[PDB]
Design an enzyme around this catalytic site. Structure first.
Site, PDB file in Angstrom:
ATOM      1  N   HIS A   1      41.734  25.670  48.567  1.00 17.70           N
ATOM      2  CA  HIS A   1      41.575  24.893  47.340  1.00 17.70           C
ATOM      3  C   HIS A   1      41.895  23.454  47.702  1.00 17.70           C
ATOM      4  O   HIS A   1      43.059  23.011  47.630  1.00 17.70           O
ATOM      5  CB  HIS A   1      42.492  25.394  46.217  1.00 17.70           C
ATOM      6  CG  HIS A   1      42.156  26.770  45.736  1.00 17.70           C
ATOM      7  ND1 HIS A   1      43.011  27.514  44.955  1.00 17.70           N
ATOM      8  CD2 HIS A   1      41.079  27.553  45.965  1.00 17.70           C
ATOM      9  CE1 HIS A   1      42.460  28.692  44.707  1.00 17.70           C
ATOM     10  NE2 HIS A   1      41.282  28.737  45.304  1.00 17.70           N
TER      11      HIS A   1
ATOM     12  N   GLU B   1      31.397  30.524  43.180  1.00 13.55           N
ATOM     13  CA  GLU B   1      31.993  31.840  43.027  1.00 13.55           C
ATOM     14  C   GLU B   1      32.029  32.350  41.587  1.00 13.55           C
ATOM     15  O   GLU B   1      33.106  32.566  41.023  1.00 13.55           O
ATOM     16  CB  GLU B   1      33.398  31.849  43.637  1.00 13.55           C
ATOM     17  CG  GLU B   1      34.371  30.841  43.074  1.00 13.55           C
ATOM     18  CD  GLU B   1      35.650  30.816  43.863  1.00 13.55           C
ATOM     19  OE1 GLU B   1      36.381  31.845  43.860  1.00 13.55           O
ATOM     20  OE2 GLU B   1      35.917  29.765  44.495  1.00 13.55           O
TER      21      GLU B   1
ATOM     22  N   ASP C   1      66.825  34.920  60.466  1.00 15.49           N
ATOM     23  CA  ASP C   1      66.504  33.952  61.517  1.00 15.49           C
ATOM     24  C   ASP C   1      65.046  33.995  61.981  1.00 15.49           C
ATOM     25  O   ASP C   1      64.701  33.320  62.953  1.00 15.49           O
ATOM     26  CB  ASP C   1      67.401  34.185  62.726  1.00 15.49           C
ATOM     27  CG  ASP C   1      67.173  35.560  63.355  1.00 15.49           C
ATOM     28  OD1 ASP C   1      67.516  36.586  62.688  1.00 15.49           O
ATOM     29  OD2 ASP C   1      66.647  35.611  64.501  1.00 15.49           O
TER      30      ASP C   1
ATOM     31  N   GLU D   1      30.816  34.981  46.300  1.00 12.66           N
ATOM     32  CA  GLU D   1      31.179  33.615  46.645  1.00 12.66           C
ATOM     33  C   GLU D   1      30.641  33.158  47.993  1.00 12.66           C
ATOM     34  O   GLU D   1      30.813  33.829  49.008  1.00 12.66           O
ATOM     35  CB  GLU D   1      32.697  33.465  46.638  1.00 12.66           C
ATOM     36  CG  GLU D   1      33.200  32.194  47.313  1.00 12.66           C
ATOM     37  CD  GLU D   1      34.679  32.048  47.204  1.00 12.66           C
ATOM     38  OE1 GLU D   1      35.379  33.093  47.202  1.00 12.66           O
ATOM     39  OE2 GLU D   1      35.151  30.892  47.138  1.00 12.66           O
TER      40      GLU D   1
ATOM     41  N   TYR E   1      34.655  40.037  35.012  1.00  8.35           N
ATOM     42  CA  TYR E   1      35.791  40.959  35.084  1.00  8.35           C
ATOM     43  C   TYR E   1      35.962  41.593  33.737  1.00  8.35           C
ATOM     44  O   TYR E   1      36.408  40.941  32.806  1.00  8.35           O
ATOM     45  CB  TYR E   1      37.066  40.215  35.515  1.00  8.35           C
ATOM     46  CG  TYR E   1      36.775  39.236  36.639  1.00  8.35           C
ATOM     47  CD1 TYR E   1      36.490  37.894  36.363  1.00  8.35           C
ATOM     48  CD2 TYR E   1      36.732  39.656  37.958  1.00  8.35           C
ATOM     49  CE1 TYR E   1      36.196  36.994  37.378  1.00  8.35           C
ATOM     50  CE2 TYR E   1      36.432  38.763  38.976  1.00  8.35           C
ATOM     51  CZ  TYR E   1      36.164  37.438  38.679  1.00  8.35           C
ATOM     52  OH  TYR E   1      35.870  36.561  39.683  1.00  8.35           O
TER      53      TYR E   1
ATOM     54  N   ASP F   1      37.914  39.086  48.740  1.00  8.07           N
ATOM     55  CA  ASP F   1      37.997  37.626  48.858  1.00  8.07           C
ATOM     56  C   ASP F   1      38.862  37.316  50.083  1.00  8.07           C
ATOM     57  O   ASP F   1      40.073  37.558  50.094  1.00  8.07           O
ATOM     58  CB  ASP F   1      38.600  36.999  47.596  1.00  8.07           C
ATOM     59  CG  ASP F   1      38.250  35.508  47.435  1.00  8.07           C
ATOM     60  OD1 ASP F   1      37.973  34.787  48.428  1.00  8.07           O
ATOM     61  OD2 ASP F   1      38.270  35.035  46.287  1.00  8.07           O
TER      62      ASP F   1
ATOM     63  N   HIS G   1      37.733  31.726  35.133  1.00  2.68           N
ATOM     64  CA  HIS G   1      38.079  30.766  36.162  1.00  2.68           C
ATOM     65  C   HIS G   1      36.904  29.841  36.437  1.00  2.68           C
ATOM     66  O   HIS G   1      35.801  30.041  35.903  1.00  2.68           O
ATOM     67  CB  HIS G   1      38.566  31.474  37.447  1.00  2.68           C
ATOM     68  CG  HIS G   1      37.556  32.375  38.096  1.00  2.68           C
ATOM     69  ND1 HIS G   1      36.550  31.907  38.915  1.00  2.68           N
ATOM     70  CD2 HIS G   1      37.441  33.725  38.100  1.00  2.68           C
ATOM     71  CE1 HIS G   1      35.840  32.926  39.366  1.00  2.68           C
ATOM     72  NE2 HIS G   1      36.359  34.041  38.888  1.00  2.68           N
TER      73      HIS G   1
ATOM     74  N   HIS H   1      35.475  25.261  43.727  1.00  2.00           N
ATOM     75  CA  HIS H   1      36.536  24.359  44.142  1.00  2.00           C
ATOM     76  C   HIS H   1      36.158  23.671  45.447  1.00  2.00           C
ATOM     77  O   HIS H   1      35.346  24.181  46.220  1.00  2.00           O
ATOM     78  CB  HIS H   1      37.899  25.085  44.253  1.00  2.00           C
ATOM     79  CG  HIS H   1      37.904  26.248  45.191  1.00  2.00           C
ATOM     80  ND1 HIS H   1      38.016  26.105  46.558  1.00  2.00           N
ATOM     81  CD2 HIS H   1      37.824  27.580  44.956  1.00  2.00           C
ATOM     82  CE1 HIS H   1      37.990  27.300  47.124  1.00  2.00           C
ATOM     83  NE2 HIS H   1      37.882  28.214  46.174  1.00  2.00           N
TER      84      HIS H   1
ATOM     85  N   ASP I   1      35.907  30.807  53.098  1.00  2.44           N
ATOM     86  CA  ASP I   1      36.277  31.377  51.811  1.00  2.44           C
ATOM     87  C   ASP I   1      35.092  32.133  51.210  1.00  2.44           C
ATOM     88  O   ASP I   1      34.231  31.546  50.546  1.00  2.44           O
ATOM     89  CB  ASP I   1      36.749  30.266  50.872  1.00  2.44           C
ATOM     90  CG  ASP I   1      37.219  30.790  49.548  1.00  2.44           C
ATOM     91  OD1 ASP I   1      37.292  32.024  49.395  1.00  2.44           O
ATOM     92  OD2 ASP I   1      37.516  29.972  48.654  1.00  2.44           O
TER      93      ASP I   1
ATOM     94  N   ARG J   1      32.981  39.526  41.925  1.00  2.77           N
ATOM     95  CA  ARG J   1      32.849  38.121  42.293  1.00  2.77           C
ATOM     96  C   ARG J   1      31.985  38.061  43.544  1.00  2.77           C
ATOM     97  O   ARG J   1      32.079  38.925  44.411  1.00  2.77           O
ATOM     98  CB  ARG J   1      34.223  37.468  42.523  1.00  2.77           C
ATOM     99  CG  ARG J   1      34.194  35.995  42.970  1.00  2.77           C
ATOM    100  CD  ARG J   1      35.533  35.261  42.768  1.00  2.77           C
ATOM    101  NE  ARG J   1      36.673  35.750  43.574  1.00  2.77           N
ATOM    102  CZ  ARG J   1      37.662  36.546  43.144  1.00  2.77           C
ATOM    103  NH1 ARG J   1      37.700  37.025  41.901  1.00  2.77           N
ATOM    104  NH2 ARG J   1      38.637  36.885  43.970  1.00  2.77           N
TER     105      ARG J   1
ATOM    106  N   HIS K   1      43.861  37.364  41.956  1.00  3.84           N
ATOM    107  CA  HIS K   1      44.544  37.256  43.255  1.00  3.84           C
ATOM    108  C   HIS K   1      45.298  38.553  43.560  1.00  3.84           C
ATOM    109  O   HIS K   1      46.480  38.536  43.872  1.00  3.84           O
ATOM    110  CB  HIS K   1      45.497  36.036  43.320  1.00  3.84           C
ATOM    111  CG  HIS K   1      44.831  34.719  43.038  1.00  3.84           C
ATOM    112  ND1 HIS K   1      45.447  33.710  42.327  1.00  3.84           N
ATOM    113  CD2 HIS K   1      43.596  34.254  43.348  1.00  3.84           C
ATOM    114  CE1 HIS K   1      44.628  32.676  42.227  1.00  3.84           C
ATOM    115  NE2 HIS K   1      43.496  32.982  42.835  1.00  3.84           N
TER     116      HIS K   1
HETATM  117 ZN   LIG Z   1      37.064  30.130  46.516  1.00  4.71          ZN
HETATM  118 ZN   LIG Z   2      37.404  33.001  47.581  1.00  2.37          ZN
END
Ligand SMILES: [Zn+2]
Ligand SMILES: [Zn+2]
Ligand SMILES: [Mg+2]
Ligand SMILES: [Mg+2]
Ligand SMILES: [Mg+2]
Ligand SMILES: [Mg+2]
Ligand SMILES: [Zn+2]
Ligand SMILES: [Zn+2]
Ligand SMILES: [Zn+2]
Ligand SMILES: [Zn+2]
Ligand SMILES: [Zn+2]
Ligand SMILES: [Zn+2]
Ligand SMILES: [Zn+2]
Ligand SMILES: [Zn+2]
Ligand SMILES: [Zn+2]
Ligand SMILES: [Zn+2]
Ligand SMILES: [Zn+2]
Ligand SMILES: [Zn+2]
Ligand SMILES: [Zn+2]
Ligand SMILES: [Zn+2]
Lengths: 440, 440, 440, 440
Positions: free
Chosen positions: C361, C383, C38, C406, C387, C260, C350, C354, C271, C404, C243
């Site tokens: 995104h 970004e 609940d 960004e 890797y 990130d 990648h 974006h 972001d 990364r 991710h």
């Molecule tokens: Zn991003």
């Molecule tokens: Zn990001």
């Protein structure tokens, strides 16, 4: 009579003419329908799918693609051929024979539709789909459009506009071609022969269902295997029930019997009602009601023509009805006031006329209160009736009488053609027919 | 013959006997079924719901509640009475008349089922429900159980156990009572009279559907309005298609015609196949195949009794078949090896026997390979056939021949009773019947 | 910064401007979402519904009705006020306060939507609906249209055309107004302060989740209660997972950590990614990879302007990357050939950029391969990353490195504005920040 | 503290002990849940699935099969390993590592569940399934059972009995093991430290959400990443809203603040409420209400033990409450009459105690009105409160006051252990804590 390859082609082209460029129309076949457990009802194709194909199989989809004003093509999804499935459940067209047989450009396996349909819709602006017609169709269409929506990284785009083609297609179906009228003309003849035969066979002590059996046998012998709707044989008080289909009662001397029955011939419906005495002789009380219904029918047959409407002719019928009922003491008061109060409605509580075609209650816009101006090519019924309840507060002799008399007509340039006049409706002609039969 | 009020009561009690205490069984009516647009097929009740009620309306639910070994009651949900809806679509039982009419304790409005069903299931331990039978039923049942699950603050509890009653109820239906056998006996007579008539009416140049019309008319005249399944009239090569229902071909002198047709009488199915020459005289090649099928049927009719099985009798039929086909040069080799290789299967590719009752292919467990030991009260078909494909690599004269001969039987204490022997199957008797008819 | 009443009004009017006359657009609120039993997740409004309303309740529907080019009105369906439900689950706007509060013409109870929506759609030609967005919305919309379709005798007509408004509305969202840019500017500052703080707090022996806690606390203290997406803290080999949200490992001296993380401020997403040494000092091997990623970012920040595209700038990044990796011996061969073979893809798999807005995104068409020409008002990320897998066949020192970096930018008339440059990214500046923090 | 491999094994065995022989239990994982567009909320496993596995992935199903009283096995369906999907979205257990990692006998790919599940259910008598828990689970289970039902010619049989395992499993979860109690003990400590910190940080002019940020940071630093429910910080009149989660107001000197907040630690919920003055000093009016709530809590903590019930202790609280409110002039009349009239209900309108565990409002039967006799191992909250509406007709000084004080307890052999007493609740101790913090 039949519908030609060429006519099916013309109809597709007439739909494509109205479609936006960069669009596709999706027309789905009817699903098969369980009767009980593993047995199914005789297959009846979706009327719209039939209209464009004359193809009598399930698991089929017609796709009409319009690139522009002079460029379009047709794709059929249908069942693949299968030796085992055909030895069991009967022959299939398949993909090889379909282009030639049905006049389409391409035919694919229905089993591959989820892999192929989205590719056909990719990059188009508009899709014509009858949403909510069939759940299986909606699943297929929504699944195709989601693939396109979510597939932008594979350079796919869904058409953003979806249009219901039913308004367009039903407006086409509303106006019958010469070929369609020839087919309906034969449906009316077949249906008439069936009704004539029921009158000739009727005797006291037979059951309502026996007349149903005579009618269906007659449909079948002229090549109309199925009725267009469930046959109504309401004798006595059962005649006051509009869609009485139980047909389970012994027919009694002294009662009337109301038969509403119509064949399905090459997809097209006949639809006739005749009411007559079970013993072959109308009583005075029966004649008194019958004559009002018959005058209503005969006056309507005179009036129906281009430029009037179902609403306008219905007003004349109401006047005839209220006047006749006042003269019998079934209604009391001033005719014009009773008309204004719709005092006929306990006795005549349905419409005078419905569109007729691939469906007995056919598609097409009626306009508010059926006010649409009639034009040549429209096909419709004329079916006044009077139904006096067993417990109506009226003179005893009229209680429990249900009478409907119905003919099928096509609007012509100058009036109408009656497709069902080959079965008698004048009371003296009915009586003579039954007397002659009783000798046988 | 009919099924009594008392018999419907006995059946409910026999179900309740097998139910756990503190449980309820939910049996739902069939939905109505669209044929096209606003027209519907003739209503066919769910066979299980019919079995316990003899009630022929949609939107109805039988609820049997067992408190303990000596305490139970029945509740019916059904359509309320409605003057307008009944004037239109026909009469309804309603709630007042239902207890007496159908022998239930209580009757409520189906329109109130969502407000009432959960109250009937509250506090029980078990619910018997056929999950997945109908989607509308599952929605109603799941909705009731969720109310109970989530309503603990209103002191509601759902039954945690759900049991499929179909196994139990189908096991009951598998064994026919004396009343059921009397009804099926009449179904077999009616169906036989129809097949006799088709043989008598058959002439070259008539269409397959014409014989269908004769058969249906005969069903109807004895009070069996509908067939139990779609009638098969396969003349010539069409006889090689097991469920050929197109029935669209002109019947040709020189061909055989295979008719598989059965009436539905008080819910119960007749199911007969007769194959015969369209011109009334079997050719040598036709006799050669026919005699194998007939010996198969006649041997099976002798063998069927308590203690054997469909599997065991099927082995005898395979032997008869392989031997006959070897003698004709249709198969080549050692009989016992061909039998071991199932070499009959290109020509006889279906089962010899199915259960028969409220459904033509009736419910009930067959056992692995139909090995279940037969007992008195089981009702079944015996339907050997041989189907030689138009393109089978066999002597030319046997190609395109489809022959099935089928009788309906009930297992008795000492053997079986044949319900369908009143229509002839010996070739000489068939020929004499047709000759006599041609004079008538 | 915030979004004004006036801005929400402007957006609705801009949608209405693009709508056909005689149409209605239906925009539905997000459903509430269960976390467990609940308990529910913190409510997140549908971004499109939010865009037109700034209204943060479920069970709400915005209806924009266009009669013609100068005549339109807005109707809101929303939850009625309820003393009991509000004492429990919190305050509701209701119907009385909504017109003034949200600038709509009319507000009705969401509990009455099925009784009212079809009346609003009656007689229109077009309905704009995002089909398949939410199942509850589709049920409501399809139910309204079926009522209209089937209600011709009540003089109802359904709009035949349905149009997806998502393309139109997402194209609007793609171009940010000055107000939106001010809000995103503050989101970028808040997010930057959070990343600065994570660098300052990082010590060997702390867990990845500890830095997540610092970041979220910092978001919250500036009034951004929630992140725009689940925070990524990948130290060591975890930095090779794009991710990685487990954030469960002890951070080890010698490893890098990739963060990130982005706040949600007035609906708009920050972001940022920063990668840095856990112990405050980059190794030679770490610098060698980091410098390639940083040059990629810095070159991209110089290049991004109206008239180029993500695709075009991505080509420059690939060149920088392949060259840097060849110089380190991670790739071998001719740079131009390696570029043609996309030899960077095992290490940078990648996209570079974006769209950014109400969703991290964000919505908006990218064009094939993200080739769309950039224009002022577009907001996007930059970004680049490299890797190197733990088991890549490369010199040992580069294995298990994920980096990364960004930044978030808005395209201006002459170039771009960097919204996230207030957190350091040059390695010497990172090291100085951490040294200063370690003193304190 | 954590839950051992052995404990998860014990729990599965305890379920299997209660299962019928020839049965299988199906326990499904939670689906992933969208927050907005393509971003998802942090994953929260289904509590029941977690209870038997400690496995934190979606698309997983535990199948426990009992052949007989000494023979059973476990099958896990889970996501296959995938290099690309793991580089992106994070690591997967897969099938190879699962038997050892999770102590199951067999592990199969979730992508193959429709091909495998029916084979596991074939021939069993009973299936334990939580019907309606998840729609995806019902689709999978119903699809498996239909395959079995309809596959009798492939010698398949479906289990006829389906049993809800939720009653059984929730009854197990209701009684905590020593390991579970150790985990909850740590959850209570973590949650207490968070509440202590909120009191220490509170200053006039801070926003309600700032205290939420302090609390969440404290949860996180002890390894409890997420709260067990959405944090409530209701200052002033916001304290009268039971689940006030907007937390958007500036906290004002003179007001109280009510904080209801709890961490989730190894799946288990802490759940504490403390109410305190924003400025660190209770007013007389605030003390007068607070003391009633505190006496209620303290009396309840003394009373709770095996053999009493939530209902019985709630009666004592009502008495304390009605007496205190009469003495303040908030209620008027005879205490025993006011108690009989439930005159406390405008001010205390929720339950005193709920079960606590893997869900904050935990599973387990309460009995009518929460009358179930308490036994050792039950874990529950004690949370009296008084909420005087802004517009209550009471002396002005009490209007707009909301006070709740809540502790988490486990029932022991002789009484209860308080898991949350390490955060102060006596007013003098609260004031001293805040004074000390303001110096420091
Ligand atoms: Zn991003
Ligand atoms: Zn990001
Ligand atoms: Mg009379
Ligand atoms: Mg031949
Ligand atoms: Mg290394
Ligand atoms: Mg005050
Ligand atoms: Zn072309
Ligand atoms: Zn249509
Ligand atoms: Zn008619
Ligand atoms: Zn008609
Ligand atoms: Zn009783
Ligand atoms: Zn059944
Ligand atoms: Zn048969
Ligand atoms: Zn049969
Ligand atoms: Zn206006
Ligand atoms: Zn959107
Ligand atoms: Zn074993
Ligand atoms: Zn549960
Ligand atoms: Zn709490
Ligand atoms: Zn609580």
């Amino acid at each position: 009579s039949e519908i030609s390859r060429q006519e099916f082609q013309r109809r597709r082209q007439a739909l494509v003419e109205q479609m936006q460029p960069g669009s596709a129309a999706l027309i789905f076949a009817a699903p098969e329908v369980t009767r009980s457990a593993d047995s199914e009802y005789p297959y009846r194709q979706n009327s719209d799918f039939w209209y464009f194909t004359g193809f009598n199989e399930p698991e089929a989809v017609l796709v009409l693609i319009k690139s522009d004003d002079t460029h379009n093509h047709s794709v059929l999804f249908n069942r693949v051929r299968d030796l085992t499935a055909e030895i069991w459940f009967g022959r299939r067209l398949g993909q090889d024979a379909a282009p030639e047989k049905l006049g389409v450009d391409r035919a694919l396996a229905f089993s591959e539709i989820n892999q192929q349909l989205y590719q056909l819709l990719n990059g188009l602006d508009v899709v014509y789909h009858a949403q909510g017609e069939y759940a299986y169709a909606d699943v297929i269409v929504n699944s195709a459009l989601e693939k396109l929506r979510k597939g932008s990284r594979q350079n796919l785009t869904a058409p953003a506009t979806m249009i219901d083609w039913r308004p367009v297609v039903h407006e086409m179906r509303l106006f019958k071609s010469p070929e369609e009228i020839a087919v309906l003309r034969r449906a009316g003849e077949i249906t008439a022969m069936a009704h004539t035969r029921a009158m000739e066979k009727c005797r006291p002590g037979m059951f309502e269902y026996h007349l149903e059996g005579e009618i269906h046998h007659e449909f079948n012998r002229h090549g109309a295997r199925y009725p267009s709707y469930n046959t109504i044989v309401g004798s006595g008080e059962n005649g006051c029930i509009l869609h009485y289909t139980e047909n389970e009662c012994e027919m009694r001397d002294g009662d009337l019997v109301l038969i509403d029955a119509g064949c399905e011939y090459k997809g097209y419906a006949g639809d006739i009602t005749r009411t007559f005495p079970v013993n072959g002789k109308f009583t005075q009380a029966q004649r008194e009601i019958y004559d009002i219904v018959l005058e209503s029918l005969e006056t309507s047959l005179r009036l129906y023509r281009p430029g009037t409407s179902i609403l306008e002719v219905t007003g004349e019928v109401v006047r005839i009805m209220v006047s006749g009922l006042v003269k019998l003491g079934i209604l009391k008061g001033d005719v014009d006031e009773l008309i204004a109060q719709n005092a006929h409605r306990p006795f005549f509580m349905h419409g005078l006329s419905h569109w007729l075609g691939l469906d007995v209650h056919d598609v097409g816009v009626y306009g508010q209160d059926r006010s649409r101006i009639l034009e040549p090519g429209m096909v419709l019924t004329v079916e006044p009736g009077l139904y006096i309840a067993p417990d109506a507060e009226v003179p005893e002799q009229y209680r429990g009488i249900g009478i409907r008399i119905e003919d099928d007509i096509v609007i012509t340039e100058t009036g109408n053609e009656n497709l069902t006049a080959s079965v008698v409706k004048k009371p003296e002609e009915i009586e003579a027919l039954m007397v002659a039969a009783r000798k046988q």
